[PDB]
Amino acid sequence: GAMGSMERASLIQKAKLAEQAERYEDMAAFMKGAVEKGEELSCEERNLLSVAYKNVVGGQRAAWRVLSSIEQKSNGPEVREYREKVETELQGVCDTVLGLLDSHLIKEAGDAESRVFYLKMKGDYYRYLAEVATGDDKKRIIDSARSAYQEAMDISKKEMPPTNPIRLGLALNFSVFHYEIANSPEEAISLAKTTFDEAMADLHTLSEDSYKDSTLIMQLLRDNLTLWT
Amino acid sequence: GAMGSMERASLIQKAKLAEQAERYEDMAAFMKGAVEKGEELSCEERNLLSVAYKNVVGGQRAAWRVLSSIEQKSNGPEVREYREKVETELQGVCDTVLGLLDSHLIKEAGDAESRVFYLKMKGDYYRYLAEVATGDDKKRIIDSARSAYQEAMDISKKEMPPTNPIRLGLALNFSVFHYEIANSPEEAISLAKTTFDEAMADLHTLSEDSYKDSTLIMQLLRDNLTLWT
Amino acid sequence: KLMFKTEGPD
Amino acid sequence: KLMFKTEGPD
Numbered sequence: 001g002a003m004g005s006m007e008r009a010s011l012i013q014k015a016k017l018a019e020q021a022e023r024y025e026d027m028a029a030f031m032k033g034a035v036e037k038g039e040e041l042s043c044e045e046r047n048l049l050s051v052a053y054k055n056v057v058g059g060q061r062a063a064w065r066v067l068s069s070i071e072q073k074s075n076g077p078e079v080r081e082y083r084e085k086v087e088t089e090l091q092g093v094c095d096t097v098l099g100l101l102d103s104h105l106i107k108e109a110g111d112a113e114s115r116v117f118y119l120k121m122k123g124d125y126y127r128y129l130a131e132v133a134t135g136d137d138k139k140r141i142i143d144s145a146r147s148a149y150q151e152a153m154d155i156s157k158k159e160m161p162p163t164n165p166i167r168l169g170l171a172l173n174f175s176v177f178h179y180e181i182a183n184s185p186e187e188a189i190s191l192a193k194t195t196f197d198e199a200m201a202d203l204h205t206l207s208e209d210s211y212k213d214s215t216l217i218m219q220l221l222r223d224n225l226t227l228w229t
Numbered sequence: 230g231a232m233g234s235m236e237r238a239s240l241i242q243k244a245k246l247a248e249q250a251e252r253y254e255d256m257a258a259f260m261k262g263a264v265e266k267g268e269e270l271s272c273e274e275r276n277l278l279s280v281a282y283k284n285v286v287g288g289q290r291a292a293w294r295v296l297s298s299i300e301q302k303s304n305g306p307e308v309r310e311y312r313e314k315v316e317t318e319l320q321g322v323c324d325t326v327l328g329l330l331d332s333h334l335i336k337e338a339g340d341a342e343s344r345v346f347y348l349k350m351k352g353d354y355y356r357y358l359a360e361v362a363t364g365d366d367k368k369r370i371i372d373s374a375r376s377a378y379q380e381a382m383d384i385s386k387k388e389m390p391p392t393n394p395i396r397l398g399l400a401l402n403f404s405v406f407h408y409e410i411a412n413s414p415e416e417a418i419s420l421a422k423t424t425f426d427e428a429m430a431d432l433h434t435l436s437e438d439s440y441k442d443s444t445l446i447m448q449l450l451r452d453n454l455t456l457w458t
Numbered sequence: 459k460l461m462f463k464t465e466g467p468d
Numbered sequence: 469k470l471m472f473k474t475e476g477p478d
């Protein structure tokens with residue numbers, strides 16, 4: 001692609017610059033380019049990838065919801081046309097990310113910390129597709145997300161401690177999937193409570209710095225449980 | 230361009246949607262398309278144009294300043310390359326806006342409220358170029374801004390009351406030009422005080438609603454004077 | 459839309 | 469950069 005001629009390390013440097021400048025489309029373009037060099041990513045490099053695309057797709061999702069709500073209220077073609085335009089861009093980004101995970105990040109990820117991170121991302125980007133799906137593939141999209149999340153969960157439960165931030169962020173996300181996408185609110189609540197309680201019981205093993213990382217995500221679980229119960 | 234096949238009114242509708250969605254690049258693209266239909270703009274249409282591009286160029290300026298500061302601190306090529314990339318995009322947007330004003334918004338604007346608005350924009354977008362100019366055209370860029378602003382001022386003083394929000398926003402902007410671009414801080418202060426004091430003396434003529442619009446911009450003049458004196 | 463907490467930035 | 473007040477949005 002367009003980043004083919006730039007050095008892997010230069011792309012990573014520039015992703016970090018872009019992040020500081022709040023230039024998240026540039027950030028995502030640079031990390032895409034880094035990924036396409038074909039080497040595995042470090043922990044920090046995985047984080048840069050996720051943050052970039054998360055920021056990009058976040059703007060799209062928020063814009064989609066504004067438009068969709070206006071469209072719902074109105075029920076000429078402009079509102080639907082423009083909502084369709086934003087939706088198609090959002091779908092494009094999700095497709096791009098899924099593309100990177102399938103070609104070939106997931107298949108080369110053997111470590112629990114890499115594998116679970118990528119499979120969570122897979123579940124997330126299918127979840128983003130699900131939020132805007134109304135067609136005959138809606139069910140398959142949902143099952144793709146569920147399947148990605150579950151494989152991640154199984155690995156995380158066998159291979160990581162209950163306080164592992166990756167495992168925690170996966171469970172948070174999978175619980176919201178359950179609540180909101182799968183229409184399984186009891187499953188959502190059950191997962192979020194179990195996850196919180198098992199984390200709680202493992203905190204005693206952590207350094208002050210690990211303690212802060214874990215409890216931050218645990219508080220997110222708590223926030224959702226408060227809304228849900 | 231790409232908006233050639235869409236109806237003028239549909240472009241305006243969609244600019245308004247984009248604004249609500251905080252999709253300012255789309256907003257700007259739609260208003261560019263509206264402009265290129267070749268009809269004059271209404272007051273509301275002028276505002277939509279300005280707000281769109283203002284939002285776009287605002288993100289670029291902020292990102293430029295982050296990068297430029299990092300670049301200044303560092304004194305390999307990546308920091309300068311990436312600052313140059315953002316700068317070139319910023320220059321592109323300014324050039325596009327100046328293009329619209331020259332082809333052919335300004336020459337068809339006869340009303341004080343339209344003419345002054347467009348000439349202020351001209352001064353503003355040359356001012357944005359000036360903020361990032363280091364070359365042998367720096368002086369000409371600055372003079373283009375000064376010239377645009379001054380023509381606007383002359384018209385505003387002859388044709389609008391001292392409380393006219395357009396006139397007020399022009400004087401604010403021209404005062405910052407003086408302070409920061411022309412390195413004329415005494416001129417900046419003098420313009421901002423004179424402008425504030427003449428507005429103050431004309432408020433008695435206004436409705437409650439005009440009063441609120443005028444005093445809001447007057448407070449901006451005050452804010453700068455507080456920083457400057 | 460009431461949006462629930464999910465991992466990472468907004 | 470200390471940015472001064474100018475017309476319209478940021």
Ligand SMILES: N=C(N)c1cc(-c2ccccc2)c(CC2CCNCC2)s1
Pocket residue numbers: 019043044045047048051213
């Ligand atoms: N550029 C970014 N936004 C991020 C970079 C990294 C990272 C930095 C060094 C090594 C590995 C990862 C992130 C993970 C966090 C998790 C919480 N504690 C420390 C950092 S996020």
Ligand SMILES: N=C(N)c1cc(-c2ccccc2)c(CC2CCNCC2)s1
Pocket residue numbers: 248272273274276277280442
């Ligand atoms: N879409 C936007 N952001 C804007 C639209 C308009 C406008 C709306 C109707 C007629 C003319 C102009 C703006 C000017 C303001 C000035 C202060 N009072 C009222 C509105 S701003």
Ligand SMILES: [Cl-]
Pocket residue numbers: 081082085243
């Ligand atoms: Cl559209």
Ligand SMILES: [Cl-]
Pocket residue numbers: 014310311314
């Ligand atoms: Cl670059």
Ligand SMILES: [Mg+2]
Pocket residue numbers: 186
């Ligand atoms: Mg129950």
Ligand SMILES: [Mg+2]
Pocket residue numbers: 415
């Ligand atoms: Mg003096």
